[PDB]
Write a structure and sequence with these properties.
The protein is mainly beta and 235 residues long. It is built from 2 helices and 12 strands, in the order ββαββββββαββββ. The chain has one domain: Coagulation Factor XIII, Chain A, domain 1. The chain binds 2-acetamido-2-deoxy-beta-D-glucopyranose (NAG) and copper (II) ion. It catalyses: [(1->4)-beta-D-glucosyl]n+m + reduced acceptor + O2 = 4-dehydro-beta-D-glucosyl-[(1->4)-beta-D-glucosyl]n-1 + [(1->4)-beta-D-glucosyl]m + acceptor + H2O.
Length: 235
């Protein structure tokens, strides 16, 4: 159970973005229905009044929270991977538009899931803004909590993988457009019951055997990391 508070650009806090440049849902409940239109940008998908201005090669950091800024972030029980996608704002996220910029699942060396490292990073994870065409974009940050993912929601609606999805409105101002954005996957539609990494037993299956859902990260990406960039409590 987690939400996005706002973003930082190049280590500078852009301020509270909820319902301003983040298409915030009304609460921190997960999305579980893989076929639902809620899979695109969560349950209140509408244009919000501002977009954060960035340039290609900028570092964009999402900051998640549970109940209040810079708290426990997300329950430690919620092991799973993190991904970030981009689409043009003109799509409103409909069709084969979403391109993967970042994926983190299990780190064998540290023996930690992306979600565990996000708690240590005080809710912060980053991508580098790619050299795409200037204009308006949607950045979709997705946390997948796998603690009830031994079952499929489609078969048992009280269990299943839990999706914590947030969409930020980003305006890319300065870019040469040297890596124009390629065709994307649809949300809903990319994840199905047979997709690797949607049905997984984290209690019995070694985390080293986990494969994150396709698609793979775009070669044009520069992303990116889970790591604290700024101290919230100095503001
Ligand atoms: C899942 O979402 C689809 C498409 O919106 C819908 O038809 C179906 O009723 C949903 N399943 C449940 C259990 O609500
Ligand atoms: Cu939760």
């Amino acid at each position: 159970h987690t939400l996005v508070w706002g973003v930082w650009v190049n280590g500078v806090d852009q301020g509270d973005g909820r319902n301003i440049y983040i298409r915030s849902p009304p609460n921190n409940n997960p999305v579980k229905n893989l076929t639902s239109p809620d899979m695109t940008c969560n349950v209140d998908n509408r244009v919000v009044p501002k977009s954060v201005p960035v340039n290609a090669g900028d570092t964009l950091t999402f900051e998640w929270y549970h109940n209040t800024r810079d708290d426990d972030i997300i329950a430690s029980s919620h092991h799973g991977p993190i991904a970030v996608y981009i689409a043009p704002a003109a799509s409103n996220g409909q069709g084969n538009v979403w391109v993967k910029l970042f994926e983190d699942a299990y780190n064998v060396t540290n023996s930690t899931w992306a979600v565990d490292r996000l708690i240590t990073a005080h809710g912060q994870h980053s991508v580098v803004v790619p050299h795409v065409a200037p204009g308006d974009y949607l950045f979709r940050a997705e946390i997948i909590a796998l603690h009830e993912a031994d079952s499929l929601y489609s078969q048992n609606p009280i269990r299943g993988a839990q999706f914590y999805i947030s969409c930020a409105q980003i305006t890319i101002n300065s870019s040469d457009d040297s890596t124009p954005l390629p065709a994307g996957v649809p949300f809903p539609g990319a994840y199905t019951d047979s997709t690797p990494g949607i049905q997984f037993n984290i209690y019995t299956t070694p985390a080293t055997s986990y494969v994150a859902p396709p698609p793979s990260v775009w070669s044009g990406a520069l992303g990116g990391s889970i790591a604290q960039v700024g101290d919230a409590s100095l503001e």
